Design a protein around this ligand. Structure first.
Ligand SMILES: CCCCCCCC/C=C\CCCCCCCC(=O)OC[C@H](COP(=O)(O)OCC[N+](C)(C)C)OC(=O)CCCCCCC/C=C\CCCCCCCC
Ligand SMILES: CCCCCCCC/C=C\CCCCCCCC(=O)OC[C@H](COP(=O)(O)OCC[N+](C)(C)C)OC(=O)CCCCCCC/C=C\CCCCCCCC
Ligand SMILES: CCCCCCCC/C=C\CCCCCCCC(=O)OC[C@H](COP(=O)(O)OCC[N+](C)(C)C)OC(=O)CCCCCCC/C=C\CCCCCCCC
Ligand SMILES: CCCCCCCC/C=C\CCCCCCCC(=O)OC[C@H](COP(=O)(O)OCC[N+](C)(C)C)OC(=O)CCCCCCC/C=C\CCCCCCCC
Ligand SMILES: CCCCCCCC/C=C\CCCCCCCC(=O)OC[C@H](COP(=O)(O)OCC[N+](C)(C)C)OC(=O)CCCCCCC/C=C\CCCCCCCC
Ligand SMILES: CCCCCCCC/C=C\CCCCCCCC(=O)OC[C@H](COP(=O)(O)OCC[N+](C)(C)C)OC(=O)CCCCCCC/C=C\CCCCCCCC
Ligand SMILES: CCCCCCCC/C=C\CCCCCCCC(=O)OC[C@H](COP(=O)(O)OCC[N+](C)(C)C)OC(=O)CCCCCCC/C=C\CCCCCCCC
Ligand SMILES: CCCCCCCC/C=C\CCCCCCCC(=O)OC[C@H](COP(=O)(O)OCC[N+](C)(C)C)OC(=O)CCCCCCC/C=C\CCCCCCCC
Ligand SMILES: CCCCCCCC/C=C\CCCCCCCC(=O)OC[C@H](COP(=O)(O)OCC[N+](C)(C)C)OC(=O)CCCCCCC/C=C\CCCCCCCC
Ligand SMILES: CCCCCCCC/C=C\CCCCCCCC(=O)OC[C@H](COP(=O)(O)OC[C@H](N)C(=O)O)OC(=O)CCCCCCC/C=C\CCCCCCCC
Ligand SMILES: CCCCCCCC/C=C\CCCCCCCC(=O)OC[C@H](COP(=O)(O)OC[C@H](N)C(=O)O)OC(=O)CCCCCCC/C=C\CCCCCCCC
Lengths: 198, 198
């Protein structure tokens, strides 16, 4: 009955909470009305003054910004001209540079890769010999290693069968009485669990 | 007793593990010897080929690096000049911007900031005038609420104590038989558990 007795004190408090919620909501809204009323009076001033003054605000800034934009455009043109004239020369110089230097770079690139070709041909061939020597050795060595590992695997499995059979047998044989002792204690423990659970 | 047999079986598996590793390690050493011997014939050629490859490689790469160094010198040198000229031109281009537009922007800033003075100053005072009433509302309604909260505080304390008195007495009156029966449950549980856990 702990739930009922305690819940009774909870239901009564909740009821008393409503008894306090009533007046509190009335007083809260009562004062909130005064707040909204004052805030409305202030807001009327806020909006009116902000709006009436927003005109000269935006007008002043817009008129100035208008000139600013005009001056900006009046500058953008000659400034872009300087940039254009400059770009024409700068790009021309770069063009007149990328042409000879491009040819030179391409020519040097030719020798760069071509001289590399003269080395790549033998280099790759030598690598083939080295790789073949390694692969051939690793193949014979591999065959031996495979046999070695296979033999070790056989001995590993043979000695493992001597564990998978006798050792596991002993483990399984021990599991029987072990499970018995466990079941006996578990079954008896279940009694306590249920007994203490009511 | 079980742990004794368990460890006993582990002992047998250990001997048939260590002795298994006997020939295994001996053969593995020979196996490793094979790899080592192979590498003794592989790496010898590998290193010799590497030496006879890295030498002409670095040599030819030196030519390439020289080609590139010359290339970069023949590029960076004139490009540094062209870039300096172009940058100096751009600097002058910017100079004819940062100064004219700078003084212009400064005047724009004056027009903005000064306007802000005659726009934010009165606005701040307006805000104060509106905030004054706002604060007044918070003082009047605030003080009222403070009183309402005070009244409700007493009503809260009275209701809390109205519960605290019977609730604490009832809780203590409930905890007595509850803890008493719980103790009986604990005592029996302790005994029952010590009978199984042994
Ligand atoms: C049928 C069965 C029914 C039973 C139901 C019970 C219902 C509840 C009713 C009654 C419970 C009675 C328990 C009263 C406990 C009193 C603990 C207390 O008097 O303690 C004192 C400590 C003081 O300081 P100290 O002694 O440690 O320091 C020593 C430091 N030297 C000295 C320097 C200062 O107070 C501290 O430490 C304060 C630490 C504050 C930690 C707050 C943790 C907040 C986070 C999570 C809350 C989790 C809620 C669970 C959510 C559900 C998850 C599933
Ligand atoms: C003396 C004691 C000291 C402690 C102080 C007082 C704390 C309040 C105390 C006790 C709470 C009363 C007990 C709760 C009553 C249960 C009401 C209920 O049954 O409720 C359910 C709803 C719906 O939820 P549902 O769809 O999952 O369940 C639907 C369920 N099914 C799954 C069937 C569909 O749950 C809802 O309404 C819950 C929504 C979340 C409610 C948040 C309330 C936050 C309160 C104040 C912050 C407000 C500040 C205001 C300023 C605003 C500025 C913008
Ligand atoms: C505890 C510590 C907290 C720390 C917080 C720091 C304070 C930061 C201050 C303010 C944060 C602003 C956010 C609060 C506003 C949430 C109002 C609310 O509850 O939003 C949700 C409700 C629920 O409907 P819904 O969104 O799901 O549906 C609409 C569905 N449709 C659009 C999608 C299709 O939306 C509705 O009821 C619809 C809209 C109702 C409009 C309410 C706003 C009225 C305006 C002014 C009242 C206050 C003026 C006071 C100014 C000075 C304050 C100092
Ligand atoms: C201890 C230290 C030792 C020092 C040793 C020295 C290193 C040996 C020196 C030089 C050897 C260079 C060998 C590789 C150079 C050739 C790169 C090349 O031209 O390859 C051709 C591929 C062909 O692609 P596709 O046109 O048919 O396909 C496009 C078709 N669609 C779009 C359908 C996907 O092009 C591509 O993959 C490129 C396009 C996609 C990019 C993929 C990722 C590229 C990044 C890195 C690769 C760098 C390898 C360099 C290291 C060499 C190790 C020997
Ligand atoms: C001999 C001694 C043996 C030991 C026995 C006792 C161990 C009890 C331990 C853990 C389990 C929690 C027990 C809660 C009982 C069920 C409440 C319930 O029926 O629950 C419904 C919700 C709904 O979800 P669903 O239908 O999708 O899942 C259901 C999933 N279907 C059906 C596949 C299964 O299931 C959920 O919540 C499921 C999530 C897990 C339950 C979490 C809630 C646990 C209760 C209280 C924690 C208090 C938190 C306090 C508030 C903190 C605020 C900060
Ligand atoms: C193509 C046209 C040519 C362009 C010309 C540039 C050519 C490249 C040359 C120089 C650039 C410098 C690179 C910056 C890297 C390190 C910055 C640094 O060391 O940082 C930490 C310092 C610590 O403070 P401290 O008191 O110890 O150092 C003050 C004492 N001192 C200045 C003697 C060191 O912080 C400082 O120096 C504070 C940094 C504030 C810097 C304000 C510069 C304002 C001028 C112009 C604005 C330009 C806008 C245009 C952008 C578009 C370009 C396309
Ligand atoms: C001197 C006088 C005093 C004034 C002081 C300032 C006080 C602030 C109070 C009131 C003024 C704000 C009220 C008006 C705001 C509404 C602006 C508006 O017209 O709203 C609507 C837009 C619409 O959506 P749309 O234009 O994208 O779509 C267009 C359509 N389309 C998708 C289709 C293509 O929605 C938007 O503008 C979305 C805006 C919400 C996003 C806010 C994100 C802010 C970012 C960072 C804040 C950092 C927080 C981290 C903490 C550090 C703090 C330092
Ligand atoms: C129903 C009317 C009862 C009124 C109060 C009585 C009991 C309090 C009950 C509920 C309040 C729960 C909210 C959290 C309470 C924290 C308790 C705590 O553990 O507090 C100490 C910790 C220590 O941290 P600290 O030393 O760094 O901070 C303090 C330093 N500080 C001033 C310099 C910055 O502070 C913190 O956790 C930070 C917050 C501490 C807030 C202190 C404000 C105290 C205000 C007034 C004193 C009592 C007026 C009583 C009215 C008469 C009613 C009849
Ligand atoms: C169902 C869903 C709803 C459930 C909600 C849960 C309701 C519980 C809510 C709030 C109460 C939290 C309690 C914290 C206040 C302590 C009251 C108290 O036991 O204080 C006596 C102590 C004595 O000193 P000491 O060193 O031994 O203790 C410090 C202990 N140590 C050292 C271990 C840290 O003094 C202090 O802690 C220093 C006094 C600090 C004064 C703080 C006053 C703050 C004022 C207003 C904040 C508003 C709270 C509103 C919530 C209540 C509405 C009715
Ligand atoms: C995602 C990232 C992309 C890369 C971005 C790079 C941006 C860099 C930003 C600004 C320019 C920086 C300009 C830096 C100029 C200074 C270069 C120089 O000598 O620096 C000195 C450092 C010295 O390091 P130390 O560790 O020795 O000393 C530090 C010391 N321990 C301490 O605690 O203080 O050496 C080093 O940094 C390491 C070796 C450098 C060798 C140079 C190698 C340069 C080689 C060639 C030139 C560059 C190629 C240009 C290609 C165009 C032409 C073809
Ligand atoms: C889900 C859990 C619900 C219960 C929860 C309880 C607490 C929950 C709260 C927090 C979690 C706990 C978090 C604990 C964190 C660490 C606690 C701690 O300090 O542990 C260390 C100690 C010390 O061990 P050491 O003993 O080996 O010796 C000293 C130690 N090195 C030192 O430097 O001090 O260990 C000991 O106390 C050993 C003594 C054991 C006593 C024998 C006890 C004998 C117990 C049982 C025997 C019966 C079984 C019979 C089986 C049948 C026969 C085979």
């Amino acid at each position: 009955l702990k739930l009922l007795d305690n819940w009774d004190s909870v239901t009564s408090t909740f009821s008393k909470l409503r008894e306090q919620l009533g007046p509190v909501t009335q007083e809260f809204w009562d004062n909130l009305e005064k707040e909204t009323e004052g805030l409305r009076q202030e807001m009327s001033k806020d909006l009116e003054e902000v709006k009436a003054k927003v005109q000269p605000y935006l007008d002043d800034f817009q008129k100035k910004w208008q000139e600013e934009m005009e001056l900006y455009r009046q500058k953008v043109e000659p400034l872009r001209a300087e940039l254009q004239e400059g770009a024409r020369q700068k790009l021309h110089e770069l063009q007149e540079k990328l042409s000879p230097l491009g040819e030179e770079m391409r020519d040097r690139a030719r020798a760069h890769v071509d001289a590399l070709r003269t080395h790549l041909a033998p280099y790759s061939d030598e690598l083939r010999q080295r790789l073949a020597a390694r692969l051939e050795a690793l193949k014979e060595n591999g065959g031996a290693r495979l046999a070695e590992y296979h033999a070790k695997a056989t001995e590993h499995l043979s000695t493992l069968s001597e564990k998978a059979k006798p050792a596991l047998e002993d483990l399984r044989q021990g599991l029987l009485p072990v499970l018995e002792s466990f079941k006996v204690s578990f079954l008896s423990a279940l009694e306590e669990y249920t007994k203490k659970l009511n």
